[PDB]
């Protein structure tokens, strides 16, 4: 209901729908200084991020969100923590958590920081 | 190696050293504008946060970090993601996910945003 929560949820929904259906379009939600750390691998800068995301087999994956937490930051950014499980077909692959730091630039929400970790947690 | 990693890493170690030894000292790394979401419950400000953390029904608390990721934000902040297990007295070991967002205020790195969530770590 709160503004930061409405935007955070909308973004998360938008992010996973893009990821599970059109990864190539994800670049649109990042900026040059964005950072992504995927399973320990650091990809600093949009060029690096777009290459990594586009190098993922994921020729069939789907994310299932079990829980999400959103908070506004002092600088009016939105920090979001997502926890869930990513599947294949319908049978469970790893469990995961993902943190996003969202910032509004030229009036558009973009992700400046993306961190993803796989985890054998059922949540 | 990178500066943000050295700092965030340094912050994380200290944070858990305090948490595991005297939760009432955690006031030093939080400020009034600080937001804490603990297992879905939200608190704002140093006083409410230390209050909440201090109220956890535990005598001995021990965090075990299995992985930590740090990145710099476009606003000179450091965003940290931690995963590990938690041991509180005689409670079964449970995995946890925790995100911190750090900002330098008055020559001091403080946490403006914190999100903690446990995994129903069975076994």
Swiss-Prot record, chains A, B:
The modification N6-acetyllysine is found at residue 1. It is found in: Cytoplasm, Cytosol; Nucleus outer membrane; Nucleus, Nuclear pore complex; Nucleus inner membrane. Residues 7-118 form the NTF2 domain. It holds the Pfam family NTF2. GO terms for cellular component: cytosol; nuclear inner membrane; nuclear membrane; nuclear outer membrane; nuclear pore central transport channel; nucleoplasm. One of its GO terms (molecular function) is nuclear import signal receptor activity. Changing residue 16 to A: Loss of interaction with GDP-bound RAN. Loss of GDP-bound RAN nuclear import. Changing residue 114 to N: Decreased interaction with GDP-bound RAN. No effect on interaction with nucleoporins. No effect on proteins nuclear import. The keyword Protein transport applies. One of its GO terms (biological process) is positive regulation of protein import into nucleus. Disulfide bonds: none annotated. Keywords: Acetylation, Cytoplasm, Membrane, mRNA transport, Nuclear pore complex, Nucleus, Protein transport, Translocation, Transport. Changing residue 63 to A: Loss of interaction with GDP-bound RAN. No effect on interaction with nucleoporins. Decreased proteins nuclear import. InterPro entries: NTF2, NTF2-like_dom_sf, NTF2_dom, Nuclear_transport_factor_2_euk. SUPFAM superfamilies: NTF2-like. Changing residue 61 to Q: No effect on homodimerization. Loss of interaction with GDP-bound RAN. Decreased interaction with nucleoporins and localization to the nuclear pore complex. Mediates the import of GDP-bound RAN from the cytoplasm into the nucleus which is essential for the function of RAN in cargo receptor-mediated nucleocytoplasmic transport. Thereby, plays indirectly a more general role in cargo receptor-mediated nucleocytoplasmic transport. Interacts with GDP-bound RAN in the cytosol, recruits it to the nuclear pore complex via its interaction with nucleoporins and promotes its nuclear import. Homodimer. Interacts with RAN (GDP-bound form); the interaction is direct and regulates RAN nuclear import. Interacts with the nucleoporins NUP54, NUP58 and NUP62 (via FG repeats); recruits NUTF2 to the nuclear pore complex a step required for NUTF2-mediated GDP-bound RAN nuclear import. Interacts with CAPG; mediates its nuclear import. This is Nuclear transport factor 2.
